[PDB]
Design an enzyme around this catalytic site. Structure first.
Site, PDB file in Angstrom:
ATOM      1  N   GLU B 254       0.860  -1.182   0.000  1.00 12.38           N
ATOM      2  CA  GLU B 254       0.000   0.000   0.000  1.00 12.38           C
ATOM      3  C   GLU B 254       0.898   1.234   0.000  1.00 12.38           C
ATOM      4  OE1 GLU B 254      -1.070  -0.091   4.774  1.00 12.38           O
ATOM      5  OE2 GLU B 254      -2.559  -0.949   3.411  1.00 12.38           O
ATOM      6  N   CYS B 255       1.322   1.645  -1.193  1.00 12.89           N
ATOM      7  CA  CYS B 255       2.271   2.749  -1.357  1.00 12.89           C
ATOM      8  C   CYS B 255       1.558   4.040  -1.729  1.00 12.89           C
ATOM      9  CB  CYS B 255       3.303   2.408  -2.432  1.00 12.89           C
ATOM     10  SG  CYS B 255       4.371   1.019  -1.995  1.00 12.89           S
ATOM     11  N   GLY B 256       2.013   5.146  -1.147  1.00 14.02           N
ATOM     12  CA  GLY B 256       1.504   6.483  -1.456  1.00 14.02           C
ATOM     13  C   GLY B 256       2.599   7.348  -2.045  1.00 14.02           C
ATOM     14  N   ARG B 257       3.606   7.637  -1.222  1.00 14.81           N
ATOM     15  CA  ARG B 257       4.700   8.556  -1.564  1.00 14.81           C
ATOM     16  C   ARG B 257       5.493   8.136  -2.796  1.00 14.81           C
ATOM     17  NH1 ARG B 257       6.066  11.278   2.552  1.00 14.81           N
ATOM     18  NH2 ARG B 257       5.974   9.398   3.873  1.00 14.81           N
ATOM     19  N   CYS B 332       2.018  35.586   6.680  1.00 17.51           N
ATOM     20  CA  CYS B 332       2.461  36.514   7.723  1.00 17.51           C
ATOM     21  C   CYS B 332       3.097  35.807   8.930  1.00 17.51           C
ATOM     22  CB  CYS B 332       1.287  37.399   8.168  1.00 17.51           C
ATOM     23  SG  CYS B 332       0.729  38.529   6.872  1.00 17.51           S
TER      24      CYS B 332
HETATM   25  C1  LIG Z   1      -1.636   2.596   6.960  1.00 18.76           C
HETATM   26  C2  LIG Z   1      -0.780   3.357   5.990  1.00 18.76           C
HETATM   27  N1  LIG Z   1      -0.545   2.787   4.803  1.00 18.76           N
HETATM   28  C3  LIG Z   1       0.166   3.475   3.901  1.00 18.76           C
HETATM   29  C4  LIG Z   1       0.679   4.740   4.104  1.00 18.76           C
HETATM   30  C5  LIG Z   1       1.366   5.434   2.959  1.00 18.76           C
HETATM   31  O1  LIG Z   1       2.762   5.430   3.293  1.00 18.76           O
HETATM   32  P1  LIG Z   1       3.819   5.911   2.213  1.00 18.76           P
HETATM   33  O2  LIG Z   1       3.155   7.033   1.400  1.00 18.76           O
HETATM   34  O3  LIG Z   1       4.997   6.507   2.995  1.00 18.76           O
HETATM   35  O4  LIG Z   1       4.178   4.727   1.395  1.00 18.76           O
HETATM   36  C6  LIG Z   1       0.479   5.333   5.361  1.00 18.76           C
HETATM   37  C7  LIG Z   1       1.180   6.635   5.709  1.00 18.76           C
HETATM   38  N2  LIG Z   1       0.334   7.700   6.273  1.00 18.76           N
HETATM   39  C8  LIG Z   1       0.668   9.069   5.843  1.00 18.76           C
HETATM   40  C9  LIG Z   1       2.091   9.487   6.191  1.00 18.76           C
HETATM   41  N3  LIG Z   1       2.262  10.939   6.152  1.00 18.76           N
HETATM   42  C10 LIG Z   1       3.350  11.552   5.668  1.00 18.76           C
HETATM   43  O5  LIG Z   1       4.346  10.949   5.277  1.00 18.76           O
HETATM   44  C11 LIG Z   1       3.288  13.067   5.644  1.00 18.76           C
HETATM   45  C12 LIG Z   1       2.951  13.714   6.995  1.00 18.76           C
HETATM   46  O6  LIG Z   1       1.611  13.340   7.321  1.00 18.76           O
HETATM   47  C13 LIG Z   1       3.030  15.249   6.954  1.00 18.76           C
HETATM   48  C14 LIG Z   1       2.224  15.902   8.054  1.00 18.76           C
HETATM   49  O7  LIG Z   1       1.063  15.617   8.265  1.00 18.76           O
HETATM   50  O8  LIG Z   1       2.875  16.789   8.758  1.00 18.76           O
HETATM   51  C15 LIG Z   1       3.889  13.175   8.076  1.00 18.76           C
HETATM   52  O9  LIG Z   1       3.492  12.538   9.030  1.00 18.76           O
HETATM   53  O10 LIG Z   1       5.145  13.462   7.862  1.00 18.76           O
HETATM   54  C16 LIG Z   1      -0.269   4.627   6.307  1.00 18.76           C
HETATM   55  O11 LIG Z   1      -0.451   5.145   7.546  1.00 18.76           O
END
Ligand SMILES: Cc1ncc(COP(=O)(O)O)c(CNCCNC(=O)C[C@](O)(CC(=O)O)C(=O)O)c1O
Ligand SMILES: NCCNC(=O)C[C@](O)(CC(=O)O)C(=O)O
EC number: 4.1.1.117
Lengths: 383, 383
Positions: B254-257, B332
């Site tokens: 389950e990839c996002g980034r 600001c």
């Molecule tokens: C269950 C589950 N599955 C998949 C993912 C997705 O992970 P990947 O994208 O890394 O692969 C996440 C990451 N959950 C989201 C992770 N969030 C971030 O990386 C950005 C941020 O939320 C910024 C902020 O809010 O200040 C943080 O905590 O740094 C998750 O929690």
């Protein structure tokens, strides 16, 4: 608790899930009446809507304040719902040509110019439209390097440039060095510095010192709720300083946000789940820090209070803990979603409601509402 | 710059303000095709939409991936527009009764249960609706976060799940690490998930159908040339499935980034350049309320500079070269910083900054309406 509990009990009685923002408008009006009336005749109070620009908040505030302080064309438009343009004052380090032309078109009271390049961008629009504009030059006094205003040594050259532009009306200066100062005695000394600086430039360059914007930065105490800014002590000493420094013919203004709306706002949310992970206890709440980012941004444990709900909606037992270091979190899938880390909680259960006090300033307004696409918290305004 | 420069030149030629999110969909498709084809047949890729849930991004992504990972009712709703319910998996530490009922009603593929109390709330809804649900149990393997079930508590929740007739336990969900750049260390963590998952299935005497291996595939923001070695990871990941005898156990990431980071750009024009107490600043259109990633992660976000030759004003540009410069937005707050004291080769007012790798947790984590600025324009390049 006394203010929010009747609202929480209604929501429980109606089986509505509790994830709300509650605002006490009576307490807001009472607070504003006191602050504005205490000021001397030559001083004014502008509300800086950055802290909270919800339409109902602005509707309530407009009656008591001189005007609005705004940081964009969007804040001008929100302000124009309840105030004329000539009671709107526009600050910011990156005002676009669009914003400047819109500000000039609407005829805003003052533009707080933060650079030589901005002055020239403004002046070009004024020559194009064939209008004039009252301004203040925003000054950055020597504390640290920031992006805001004209550096102290550059100020002289920006004055001389503004004075020879016929479309510019140089009223005076705008100072906003600090934010969140809790010391009333110290804030009076900051104002003394502003008066001496403003008078020196006025005397050096020989133009009338018509107006000084003394900024905002009147503090709110989130650690100790009993030790707030001593406003009555400030105002009475501030009055003495005006007569000592001979600023009675100079019109003054503050641009306060946090101090006006902080204590009258509440973020209330139900406990969804309590769990122990590798020793540490956690309470998972409805909503999250994407609705109320203040504790994450400022990196503190936000003050709260626990409403103990006595009924149980499920056939199975509630999860309860007593007298543990508990970390308060929301529904988000990030470890940064933390309201409070390892704080004492005497009693907490699933179904209880956490009442975060002092949520009215830079709570909802600074938050990343749509991160993870959760539905918005519900808004109740008490009258 | 090859991808974004044609768009920047069009905007300047048309005299539109430059404050844009630009996305490379062609690049996104090639990235997806490469990842989805290279996986073994027992492993699927789900897109964690928290990184970027823009409807154009989801539409593009839905063609290639098996499904969407979601963590709210809103994310489910977005996912349902491009995938069907039986290719959506639902995680998160605070699933509300409304979200659980919605998920069951729509018929989601899996719910990743993170506690005993959630399991019991889900079961109560399942018995009411007279429905069944496939689940995984999210495990937190032995630092403490709010997520999943603590390792020691896992046995009790398995036993409770097996006794529930309406629950169908497929297996387990592990999401231990976040933003890992080393392919070899990730294989060890995946090996550790296999050892733990089999151990529980053999002990508790039920068929290990599925393992969600989570995300946490890193993206390098400091050094852009040194990204995650996917081809290196996938071949050793394929080796490991055979070693640990996991060919009949069906899997997913389950990839996002990793999916969307490098294909997104945040592009903005320089409004001002000033020196304050020795330090140079470049004020940009928009701000960190539109692109919060640099502030949240506390780094200098990588960028390129597009020079614009023409001058729209009758007065001179502010131009500098070979200066350490802090990049800031229109806000600001002094926390509105994209990058701090970064050596810039040459920059003027009216040039365009191009922040790279802005596609993942850029717009989606940001506080869009703080100071009520208009949103940036969104362009999605497809040819
Ligand atoms: C269950 C589950 N599955 C998949 C993912 C997705 O992970 P990947 O994208 O890394 O692969 C996440 C990451 N959950 C989201 C992770 N969030 C971030 O990386 C950005 C941020 O939320 C910024 C902020 O809010 O200040 C943080 O905590 O740094 C998750 O929690
Ligand atoms: N620094 C004193 C001024 N504080 C605020 O006005 C709130 C906020 O703007 C909110 C935030 O973006 O984190 C902040 O900069 O912390």
């Amino acid at each position: 608790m006394r203010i929010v509990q009747p609202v929480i009990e209604q929501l429980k009685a109606q089986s509505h899930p509790v994830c709300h923002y509650i605002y006490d408008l009576v307490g807001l009006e009472h607070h504003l009446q006191h602050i504005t009336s205490s000021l001397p005749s030559n001083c004014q109070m502008y509300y800086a809507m950055a802290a909270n620009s919800e339409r109902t908040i602005l509707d309530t505030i407009s009656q008591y304040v001189e005007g609005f302080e705004v940081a964009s064309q969007g804040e001008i438009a929100k302000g124009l719902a309840f105030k004329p343009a000539n009671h709107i004052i526009f600050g910011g380090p990156g005002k676009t040509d669009e914003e400047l032309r819109y500000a000039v078109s609407e005829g805003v009271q003052r533009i707080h110019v933060e650079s030589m390049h901005e002055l020239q961008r403004l002046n070009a629009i004024l020559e194009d439209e064939d209008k004039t504009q009252h301004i203040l030059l925003r000054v950055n006094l020597a504390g640290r390097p920031t992006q805001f205003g004209i550096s102290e040594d550059e100020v002289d050259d920006v004055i001389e440039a503004a004075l020879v532009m016929p479309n510019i009306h140089l009223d005076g200066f705008h100072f906003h060095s600090i934010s969140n100062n809790l010391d009333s005695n110290l804030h009076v000394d900051v104002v003394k510095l502003y008066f001496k600086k403003a008078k020196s430039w006025s005397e050096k360059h020989r133009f009338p010192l018509k107006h000084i914007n003394l900024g905002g930065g009147i503090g709110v105490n989130y650690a100790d709720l009993t030790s707030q800014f001593e406003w009555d002590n400030f105002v009475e000493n501030f009055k003495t300083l005006i007569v000592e420094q001979e600023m009675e013919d100079v019109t003054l203004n503050f641009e306060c946000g946090r101090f006006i709306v902080a204590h009258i706002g509440y973020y209330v949310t139900e406990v969804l789940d309590i769990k122990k992970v590798h020793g540490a206890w956690y309470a998972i709440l409805r909503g999250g820090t994407q609705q109320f980012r203040l504790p994450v941004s400022w990196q503190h444990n936000h003050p709260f209070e626990i409403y103990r709900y006595k009924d149980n909606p499920y056939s199975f037992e509630k999860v309860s803990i007593s007298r543990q270091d508990t970390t308060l979190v929301g529904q988000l899938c990030t470890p940064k979603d933390v309201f409070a880390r390892e704080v004492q909680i005497d009693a907490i259960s699933t179904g209880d409601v956490i009442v975060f006090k002092y949520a009215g300033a830079y709570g909802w307004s600074i938050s990343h509402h749509d991160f993870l696409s959760h539905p918005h918290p519900e808004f109740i305004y008490l009258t």
